[PDB]
């Protein structure tokens, strides 16, 4: 995902698989964020990762 | 600085302005070398907004009276936060370059705008 987004930051036309993978990577990077003083248990983490 | 004991409008204003300054610092030398003509419409609009933000922060003080003849200025907090929200919304991008030097208040900014 970094290997694709560092290059195609200024690309409008892409391979469909490349754009989908970029979208997946960006979504995962957005999702991994977490606030402070907020412990998590294993089960909800498994749900979120799934 | 935290929303628990401070209003969240301050928090979001600070976050937006710091992100704007971070991106602007990153794109500084790119604007320097490759030119503004190679940037995107969002790049151009953000660059202009950052120019406005960077020039807007300046304000005069009493102690400068020895050095310059202009007396200083003081401004309360709510007016400043409203002005900063208005700037970061981008509704004042039409203002000229000169109107964004040594501005203490919104009324001073408007009177400077009318002078040109």
């Amino acid at each position: 995902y970094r290997e694709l987004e560092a290059f195609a930051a200024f690309a409008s036309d892409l391979d469909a698989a490349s754009k989908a993978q970029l979208d997946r990577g960006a979504r995962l990077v957005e999702l991994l964020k977490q606030p402070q003083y907020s412990p998590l248990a294993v089960e909800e983490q498994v749900v979120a990762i799934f | 600085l935290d929303p628990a004991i401070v209003g969240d409008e301050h928090y979001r204003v600070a976050q937006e302005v710091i992100r704007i300054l971070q991106r602007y610092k990153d794109l500084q030398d790119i604007i320097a070398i490759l030119g503004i003509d190679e940037l995107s419409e969002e790049d151009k609009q953000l660059v202009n907004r950052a120019r406005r933000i960077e020039r807007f922060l300046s304000q005069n003080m009493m102690a400068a009276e020895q050095f310059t003849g202009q007396p200083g200025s003081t401004v309360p907090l709510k007016e400043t936060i409203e002005a900063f929200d208005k700037l970061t919304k981008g509704e004042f991008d039409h203002l000229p370059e000169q109107a964004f030097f040594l501005i203490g208040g919104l009324d001073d900014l408007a009177k400077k705008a009318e002078s040109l």
């Binding site: 290059f7 200024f10 690309a11 | 030398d29 490759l34």
Partner: protein, 292 residues
């Protein structure tokens, strides 16, 4: 020193990043340019077929078809781009123009030149030569109207030299031209783009060997040629823009690959400097410590 080295590293790394980004910009533009250039083929084929059919059994006489008795002068139009960072594109175009001017100087004629593009505009303004007219601001994205008006102007200028005898304009009242030239670049390949000059002002008839005309065939012929000239002019521009973008991409790719090396060398030099500084520092502190 150290801070100068670090700042140069930052500047060169950022230049590397943005050179690759704008090279990708050029690569993306190549696709849409190639998609757009290849849509005017059917109309050109139809206009050619209709011209061939009309002239198949028509009278062979026209001021554009015939030639002037005297070679008084010769017009010429050379194309260029509206953006820099193209590499040798401008250099190739200017070299072709200079070679053509040198070739034309053999006849002793005084030509007049027409140019499209701001870079060549400045280049020729700096030099000692007249330019009657120039066009800029739409080389990146042209339209049929510009080509149509340009073809009209050039055809009128050529017509305006029918009776140019000596220095006398004659009934034309204005000195006209008796020959035209076209300079542009062709897309031979993604890597092969050779500048091409062509002459197409006087029409020539060739027979390779071997309907109804409701209006006047001669009038149809007379109105038909200007459309053909305009279509050729329009077809030239997309080819030129495609060649421009194709030459654009490679120079910036190479700039990126060469910009890597300065980062590498400067990092090596900085490491050597810092280790020398630290070893000198420890040597000096040792000499101070043990001397007492």
């Amino acid at each position: 020193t150290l801070r100068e080295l670090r700042g140069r590293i930052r500047s060169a790394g950022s230049i590397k990043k943005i050179t690759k980004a704008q090279e990708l910009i050029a690569t993306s533009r190549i696709a849409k340019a190639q998609a757009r250039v290849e849509a005017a083929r059917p109309y050109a084929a139809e206009i050619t077929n209709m011209l061939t059919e009309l002239a198949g059994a028509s009278a062979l006489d026209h001021p554009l078809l015939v030639e002037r008795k005297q070679p008084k002068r010769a017009g010429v139009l050379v194309v260029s781009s509206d953006r820099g960072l193209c590499g040798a594109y401008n250099a190739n175009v200017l070299r072709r123009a200079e070679e053509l001017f040198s070739l034309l100087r053999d006849e002793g004629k005084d030509p007049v030149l027409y140019v499209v593009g701001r870079k060549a505009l400045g280049y020729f303004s700096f030099r000692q030569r007249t330019v009657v007219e120039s066009w800029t601001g739409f080389s990146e994205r042209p339209t049929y109207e510009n080509a149509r008006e340009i073809a009209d102007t050039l055809v009128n200028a050529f017509m305006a030299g029918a009776d140019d005898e000596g220095d006398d304009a004659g009934a034309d009242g204005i000195l006209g031209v008796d020959e035209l030239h076209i300079v542009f670049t062709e897309f031979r390949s993604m890597l092969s783009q050779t500048a091409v000059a062509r002459r197409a002002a006087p029409m020539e008839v060739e027979y390779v060997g071997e309907y109804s005309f409701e209006p006047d065939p001669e009038t149809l012929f007379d109105a038909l040629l200007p459309r053909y000239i305009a279509t050729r002019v329009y077809a030239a521009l997309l080819e030129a823009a495609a060649s421009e973008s194709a030459s654009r991409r490679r120079a910036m790719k190479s700039a990126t690959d060469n910009a890597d090396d300065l980062i590498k060398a400067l990092t090596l030099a900085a490491n050597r400097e810092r280790q020398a500084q630290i070893t000198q520092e420890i040597s000096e502190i040792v000499g101070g410590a043990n001397a007492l």
